[PDB]
Design a protein around this motif. Structure first.
Motif, short mmCIF file in Angstrom:
data_model
loop_
_atom_site.label_atom_id
_atom_site.label_comp_id
_atom_site.label_asym_id
_atom_site.label_seq_id
_atom_site.Cartn_x
_atom_site.Cartn_y
_atom_site.Cartn_z
N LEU A 10 -27.05 35.15 22.79
CA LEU A 10 -28.48 35.43 22.87
C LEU A 10 -29.21 34.24 23.47
O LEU A 10 -29.21 33.15 22.89
N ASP A 11 -29.85 34.46 24.62
CA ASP A 11 -30.73 33.47 25.25
C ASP A 11 -32.09 33.58 24.58
O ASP A 11 -32.90 34.44 24.92
N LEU A 12 -32.36 32.69 23.63
CA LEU A 12 -33.62 32.76 22.90
C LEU A 12 -34.80 32.29 23.74
O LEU A 12 -35.94 32.40 23.28
N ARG A 54 -32.68 25.88 18.42
CA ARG A 54 -32.55 25.03 19.60
C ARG A 54 -32.83 23.56 19.29
O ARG A 54 -33.67 22.96 19.96
N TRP A 110 -28.00 22.06 21.20
CA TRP A 110 -27.73 23.47 20.95
C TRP A 110 -27.01 24.10 22.15
O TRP A 110 -27.15 23.66 23.29
N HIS A 134 -25.21 31.11 19.73
CA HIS A 134 -26.12 32.16 19.25
C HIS A 134 -25.38 33.49 19.42
O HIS A 134 -25.60 34.25 20.37
#
Ligand SMILES: CC(C)(COP(=O)(O)OP(=O)(O)OC[C@H]1O[C@@H](n2cnc3c(N)ncnc32)[C@H](O)[C@@H]1OP(=O)(O)O)[C@@H](O)C(=O)NCCC(=O)NCCS
Ligand SMILES: CC(C)(COP(=O)(O)OP(=O)(O)OC[C@H]1O[C@@H](n2cnc3c(N)ncnc32)[C@H](O)[C@@H]1OP(=O)(O)O)[C@@H](O)C(=O)NCCC(=O)NCCS
Ligand SMILES: *C(=O)CCCCCCCCCCCCC
Ligand SMILES: *C(=O)CCCCCCCCCCCCC
Ligand SMILES: [Cl-]
Ligand SMILES: [Cl-]
Lengths: 8, 390, 391, 8
Positions: free
Chosen positions: C56-58, C97, C101, C106
C-alpha cells in the motif's frame, strides 16, 4: 573514492 | 597529497588531525569507537565559502543525474600522469548511489549560488560492515569531487564535515571509504593489478608499455585468451540464484576481517546483472546446484590527451566452493574479453594474490588505501580485506 | 485469550511453529531463538483463492483512505464490543512512514475481483535496546483482518508474509504488543484512565458511577485547573529537537526495553502535529530545556449509540523529567489534554508511571497490553522496566 | 497492535 591505476 | 606512507610521514594533516581517526604513527591494539555516539547533533549546515550553497541531489531527476555525471566526467579521479580520467556512466551512478536504504540528503552537492552550477559532491550509502569481531551499521563514502576551478580552497574538508553531520542525524557514527592517497590512517593497503585483454590498444594509448625486449606480435601472443570459458555449467546469474548467491557470499566472506554484511535484497542490487554496469556469472553443476560465482563491474575512462574510452572491468566478488579460483578467474578474463573490455583490473585483497601472477596480471602504479572513520582497530594485510567498493 | 489463566489452557498451533519461547518455560538466557537465515523464500506466501497481496502506497490519498476505512470498520475493539479504534489517516501516515519506512512493509490483502482491501499488517524499522543488547529490529503494528474473512487462517499468513519481507532486508528480530496473551510476553502492562469529561464517559459506559458516589461529586472529583502550572512550559519547536533527543536518550537508559532514536527519529516522533502528537518542553529561566511531556491522539468509535459517536482519547507517550517533578509534569499534561478537548487521558503502568497514576486520580482499566519480542530469548521484566511506547 | 481498555 576509487583509485585510477595503470601498468607500472 | 602523499601517495606513500613515507611521504605521509613528512606531512602535517591540518584537517585529519581534528577528526576521530588514529594518528599515522600509532600502532593500534584496541577495538572500538574513537568518540561516543552523539546525543545532540548540529542542526545547521556547515558554512561554505561566499557564493556557494548546499544541495541534495535527487538522482531520479534525469537532469540532476546528468549534472553529476558531467561534474565527475570533467573533474573526478585521474591516473598518476593525467592521461586517463574515470568516466562513470549515469546508469552506473544510479547503481552505486541508490542501493537499498539510500537517502537523497546523502547525495550532498555544492552549487554556485548565482548560476546553480554543480561544483562539488560527496555521497554516503548505508552498509552493514563486519570489522574483526564486530558488526556495525556504517556508511560507505564515495565520489568526493571538487571542480578543478575550486581546488585548494578548503572545500573538501567542508564536504566531509557536512556529510558527517548528515549521517550523524540518521544515527550512524562510523564510515568506511577508500582513497588513492595516504591519510590518517589506513586499516589496510591494497594494490591494483592489471590483465591486458586488448594489448594493442593499451600500448597505443600508453596505458601499458611494450616490454621493449618483446615485440607487439609476441605481446599479443602472450596475452591471447580462449574464445569461450572452460568451466562446466557457467551461465549468467538469474533471479532464481539470488538466495544461493547470498548464501555463498555470506559463508565465503567469514574468512576475512573487513567485509560487507549484505541482506538478500542488497545481494540482488549489487549482483543482479545490468548491462554495462555489473556482470555476475554462476556455476550450476550437474546436480543443478550453484557452487561458485564471479562478478565484475564496468568502469570506462576518458583518454585525456587524444577517441573511444578505455573500457575496464573491475573484479568485484568471486566466490569458489567447487570450481578452483584460478579456473573461475580464467573464465572471468575470457568473458571480459568477449564483452569488449580492454583491461581487467583486480586488487590484491581476499585470495587474489593466489591467481594474479599465474593469470598474467601485471602490477599497477596505484595503491588503494582502506579507511574507517571513528573506529580504531589494528591494521590488516591486503589478503584479509574482503570489501570492494565502486 | 486475555488472561494467563485462559492462555495456559490453550494450544498455539501457529505460535508453536515460530521462534518464540513457550508460555510455560522460564528464560535464563539472552539471545536469538534461531540463527539468522542466509537464504530467504523469494515467493510470497499463498493466500486463499480469490485474494492477492498488494503493497500500500500511503502517499496515494485514496489508498490511505482505504486503509483508514479497513481499520475504522474492522480493527481492535474493547472486551465488550462497545468501542473500536478510529486511527485517523494523518495519524496512520505518522505511524507508518517514520524514517526508514518501506512500501513493501505496508502489507495489504485485496479481493481479486473487487479490489476491496480486506487485510493488513505493517512493519517499521527501529533500533531496540533490550537489556545489554542493541539490535536493529522492526515494530509490527496494525494487524487487521476483515470481519467477514476471520477464522480462516489469514492472520498467520499475514504474519509469515511480513516476516519474509523483513527477512529479505536482513532483519531477524521484531517487537510488538497485543491485548491477548501469546507465547511469550516479555512484560505485561496495564492501561489506566484519567477521566477528563466524566459525564460523557459515564453516559457511553466507558466508565461507571460507583454506588458510593453521585454524578455531582464525580464532576468535582475530576475537575482540573484552567491552565498548567509549570514555569516555562511551551510546545516543542524545531530548535528543541537536539535537546529533546539528548534528554530522551539519557532518561531511557534506566529501563530494560527501550527505543534508540536518531535525531531524525526524535523529530518524527515528537515534533507536534495537530490531532496526532503533542510535545511540550519546559524551558527554564536560563533558557535551558530541562523536561518534556508528550501524548498522542487516538480517538475511538462508539458503536450503536444514537447520540455519542466518538470518544477523544489522549495516550501518554514519553515523559522525561530532570528538574520538574514527574507528578507536576503529568498534572500539566492532564490540563493540556482537557484544554484540547479530550474526553480521557490514558497511560500505561510502565516506566515510572506508577508513581503518579493513583495520585493524579487515574482509575485502573480492564485491558492489559502485553509486550513481545520475536526471535529473541531474554528474561521477562516488570512493567516499570518497560520503556517503549508504541501506537 | 494496541489494546483498547476502559475503566475497570
Ligand atoms: C579530492 C579533492 C576533493 C580534494 O579537494 P582539493 O581542493 O584538491 O583539497 P582541499 O584544499 O579542498 O582540502 C585539502 C584537505 O583535504 C584532504 N584530502 C585531499 N584529498 C583527499 C581525499 N581523496 N580524500 C579525503 N581527504 C582528502 C587533504 O589531505 C587536506 O586535508 P589535510 O589538511 O588533513 O591534509 C579534489 O582534489 C578532487 O576532486 N580530486 C579529483 C577526484 C578525487 O580524487 N576524489 C577523491 C577520491 S579518494
Ligand atoms: C486479530 C485478528 C487479525 C486475528 O485474525 P483471525 O481471523 O480472527 O484469527 P486466524 O484464524 O486468522 O488465526 C489464528 C492464529 O492467529 C493468532 N492470533 C490471534 N490474534 C492475534 C494477535 N492480535 N496477534 C498475533 N497473533 C494472533 C492466534 O493466536 C492463532 O494462532 P495460535 O493457533 O497459535 O493460537 C482479527 O481477529 C482482527 O482483525 N481483530 C481486530 C483487530 C485486532 O485485534 N488486531 C490485532 C491486535 S494485536
Ligand atoms: C572517496 O571518495 C572517499 C572520500 C572520503 C572522504 C572522507 C570521509 C570520512 C567519513 C565521513 C562520514 C562519517 C560518517 C560517520
Ligand atoms: C499488533 O498489531 C501486533 C501484531 C503482531 C503479530 C505478530 C508479529 C510477529 C513478528 C513478525 C515479523 C518478524 C520479523 C523478523
Ligand atoms: Cl536520489
Ligand atoms: Cl507508503
Amino acid at each position: 573514492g576509487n583509485c585510477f591505476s595503470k601498468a607500472r | 597529497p602523499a601517495k606513500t606512507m613515507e611521504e605521509a610521514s613528512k606531512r602535517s594533516y591540518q584537517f585529519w588531525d581534528t577528526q576521530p581517526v588514529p594518528k599515522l604513527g600509532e600502532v593500534v591494539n584496541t577495538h572500538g569507537p574513537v568518540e561516543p555516539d552523539k546525543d545532540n547533533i548540529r542542526q545547521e549546515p556547515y558554512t561554505l565559502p561566499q557564493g556557494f550553497t548546499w544541495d541534495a541531489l535527487d538522482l531520479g531527476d534525469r537532469g540532476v543525474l546528468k549534472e553529476l555525471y558531467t561534474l565527475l566526467n570533467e573533474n573526478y579521479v585521474e591516473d598518476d600522469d593525467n592521461m586517463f580520467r574515470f568516466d562513470y556512466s549515469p546508469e552506473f551512478l544510479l547503481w552505486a548511489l541508490r542501493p537499498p536504504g539510500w537517502l537523497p540528503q546523502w547525495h550532498c552537492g555544492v552549487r554556485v549560488v548565482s548560476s546553480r552550477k554543480l561544483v562539488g559532491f560527496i555521497s554516503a550509502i548505508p552498509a552493514n560492515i563486519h570489522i574483526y569481531d564486530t558488526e556495525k551499521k556504517m556508511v560507505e563514502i564515495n565520489f568526493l569531487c571538487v571542480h578543478k576551478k575550486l581546488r585548494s580552497k578548503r572545500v573538501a574538508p567542508v564536504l566531509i564535515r557536512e556529510i558527517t553531520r548528515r549521517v550523524h542525524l540518521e544515527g550512524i557514527f562510523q564510515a568506511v571509504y577508500t582513497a588513492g592517497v595516504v591519510l590518517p590512517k589506513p586499516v589496510g593497503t591494497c594494490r591494483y593489478w592489471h590483465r591486458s585483454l586488448n594489448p594493442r590498444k593499451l600500448i597505443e594509448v600508453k596505458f601499458s608499455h611494450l616490454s621493449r625486449n618483446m615485440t607487439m606480435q609476441r605481446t599479443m601472443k602472450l596475452y591471447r585468451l580462449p574464445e569461450t570459458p572452460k568451466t562446466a555449467g557457467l551461465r549468467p546469474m538469474e533471479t532464481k540464484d539470488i538466495p544461493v548467491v547470498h548464501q555463498l557470499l555470506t559463508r565465503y566472506l567469514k574468512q576475512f576481517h573487513l567485509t560487507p554484511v549484505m541482506s538478500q535484497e542488497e545481494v540482488e542490487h549489487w549482483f543482479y546483472p545490468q548491462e554495462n554496469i555489473i556482470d555476475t556469472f554462476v556455476v550450476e553443476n550437474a546436480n543443478g546446484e550453484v557452487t561458485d560465482f564471479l562478478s565484475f563491474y564496468t568502469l570506462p575512462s576518458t583518454i585525456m590527451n587524444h577517441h573511444k574510452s578505455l573500457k575496464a572491468a573491475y573484479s568485484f566478488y568471486n566466490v569458489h566452493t567447487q570450481t578452483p579460483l584460478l579456473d573461475l578467474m580464467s573464465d572471468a578474463l575470457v568473458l571480459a574479453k568477449m564483452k569488449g573490455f580492454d583491461v581487467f583490473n583486480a586488487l590484491d585483497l581476499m585470495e587474489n594474490k593466489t591467481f594474479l601472477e599465474k593469470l598474467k596480471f601485471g602490477i599497477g602504479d596505484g595503491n588503494l588505501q582502506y579507511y574507517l572513520y571513528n573506529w580504531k582497530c589494528p591494521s590488516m594485510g591486503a589478503e584479509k580485506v574482503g570489501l570492494v567498493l565502486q
